[PDB]
Amino acid sequence: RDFRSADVHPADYPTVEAVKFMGKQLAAASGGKLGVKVFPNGALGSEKDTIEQLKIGALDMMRINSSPLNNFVPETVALCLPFVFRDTQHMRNVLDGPIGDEILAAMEPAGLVGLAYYDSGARSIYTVKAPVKSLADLKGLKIRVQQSDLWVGMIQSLGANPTPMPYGEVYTALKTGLVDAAENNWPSYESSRHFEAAKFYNITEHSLAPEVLVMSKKVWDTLSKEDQALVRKAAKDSVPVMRKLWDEREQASRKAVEAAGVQVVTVANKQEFVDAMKPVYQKFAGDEKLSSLVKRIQDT
Numbered sequence: 581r582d583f584r585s586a587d588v589h590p591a592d593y594p595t596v597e598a599v600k601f602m603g604k605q606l607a608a609a610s611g612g613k614l615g616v617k618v619f620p621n622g623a624l625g626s627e628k629d630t631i632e633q634l635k636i637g638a639l640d641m642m643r644i645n646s647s648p649l650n651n652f653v654p655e656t657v658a659l660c661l662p663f664v665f666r667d668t669q670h671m672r673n674v675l676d677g678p679i680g681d682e683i684l685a686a687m688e689p690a691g692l693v694g695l696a697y698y699d700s701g702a703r704s705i706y707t708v709k710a711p712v713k714s715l716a717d718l719k720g721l722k723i724r725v726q727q728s729d730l731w732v733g734m735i736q737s738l739g740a741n742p743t744p745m746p747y748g749e750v751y752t753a754l755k756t757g758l759v760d761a762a763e764n765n766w767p768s769y770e771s772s773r774h775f776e777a778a779k780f781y782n783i784t785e786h787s788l789a790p791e792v793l794v795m796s797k798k799v800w801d802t803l804s805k806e807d808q809a810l811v812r813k814a815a816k817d818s819v820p821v822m823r824k825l826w827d828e829r830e831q832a833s834r835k836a837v838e839a840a841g842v843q844v845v846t847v848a849n850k851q852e853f854v855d856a857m858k859p860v861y862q863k864f865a866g867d868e869k870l871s872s873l874v875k876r877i878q879d880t
């Protein structure tokens with residue numbers, strides 16, 4: 581039995597290679613009983629589409645960002661907040677530990693079973709027309725965001741105007757002037773070709789929202805207890821493999837887009853951004869559940 585697993589990214593991308601590795605491990609560990617087959621390039625739909633398919637049992641697995649789950653699984657908000665993670669190592673400690681496992685389990689009420697997290701670096705704003713040197717340069721800018729209430733709030737808090745849309749629609753939106761900007765990590769900015777539409781990469785590092793690898797709960801529940809354990813272990817084993825590929829890809833991608841003429845822009849005073857964005861903590865992570873998760877993250 582091969583689980584069909586979706587990804588928006590190309591076949592060579594670290595998140596796709598990681599799930600392929602999970603598939604190899606799972607096939608071996610299960611003596612051929614279980615496996616994974618990956619469907620890259622967004623063939624099976626946008627990330628929101630694949631959430632819908634998992635919910636109804638029409639798709640077995642997806643590798644998506646945690647952000648489009650914000651509206652479905654409130655606990656994922658804690659991972660996506662601005663400046664909630666100090667750095668990569670902080671994030672990895674949190675996600676690998678009990679807090680990460682708790683948020684994966686909290687998906688079950690939505691008909692989803694979280695299996696593992698993959699890294700997504702830090703997201704930064706890239707613009708078409710001009711550099712962003714400070715908070716003021718974002719005023720009134722049309723900035724694409726993922727389909728998340730939190731993210732709409734995050735961009736509004738920067739004095740800019742959010743347009744939620746699926747990843748695959750972003751390139752043409754930048755090229756045709758529908759939006760002025762979007763935001764993402766280095767490998768996405770490269771692989772999407774957004775760097776060819778928006779040549780200013782302004783290092784804001786305003787979120788470290790990670791990826792999640794998720795199974796349809798309906799499919800999960802057809803598995804034996806023992807098969808479930810194998811599936812989890814294969815998924816977890818693929819995380820360090822993903823990270824080795826990812827950290828290398830961040831460097832390769834930055835080098836490539838600089839070679840293509842991208843202007844890498846420094847924002848001198850990030851504290852401006854931290855203070856501007858802080859209100860979303862109470863607006864979106866202010867209830868008992870979320871505020872507790874946020875505290876425990878900060879304390880790691």
Ligand SMILES: O=C(O)[C@H]1O[C@H](O)[C@H](O)[C@@H](O)[C@H]1O
Pocket residue numbers: 588643644645700726746747763764768791
């Ligand atoms: O901005 C987006 O939609 C995308 O950002 C990253 O590329 C992430 O890896 C994708 O899963 C998706 O979330």
